[PDB]
Amino acid sequence: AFVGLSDSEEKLVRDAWAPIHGDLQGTANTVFYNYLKKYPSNQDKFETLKGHPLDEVKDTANFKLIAGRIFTIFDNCVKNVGNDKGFQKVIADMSGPHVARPITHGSYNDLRGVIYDSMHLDSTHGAAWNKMMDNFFYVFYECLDGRCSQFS
């Protein structure tokens, strides 16, 4: 279920994200690369990347666009962390493009974990971050299951 964050938890999330917020595209490029490398089945899901070596596509425009758009969504979720409707809306809007797609929960969760590992958070900040991401996934998966308009 969706579980709101306190004012203090919101602050924790914003602080946890600040290093990424301040280097958003550069972090996105690295994290997205590490994700595709560690979990090689996922590159094929990206039609613009499909059929080429990872190391061939990593410094291309299409690759950086994809990495950037994932991170832009999380940056906006963080923006909206103190507004559950606003937060849900960011997710609602990005969910439609995924609904029809053959992407497993495993794949999305593997990406969440690459992000987590990259942030090297202490347990206090990690707890708050995971509250947010649990909300993120709750909303996203409700929307993938065709129960998106409950957030409207």
Ligand code: HEM
């Ligand atoms: C969970 C965090 C994710 C976020 C924030 C996110 C965000 C986005 C955004 C903003 C778009 C652009 C809308 C469009 O042009 O279609 C998009 C499209 C898409 N995403 Fe995601 N995404 C996530 C996870 C994933 C994962 C894990 C995969 C594949 C393993 C994936 C595969 C795709 C594909 C195939 C498209 C369609 C456009 C395209 O062909 O690339 N997404 N995503």
Ligand SMILES: [Cl-]
């Ligand atoms: Cl894999």
Ligand SMILES: [Cl-]
């Ligand atoms: Cl490869």
Ligand SMILES: [Cl-]
């Ligand atoms: Cl994506």
Ligand SMILES: [Cl-]
């Ligand atoms: Cl607000």
Ligand SMILES: [Cl-]
């Ligand atoms: Cl920390």
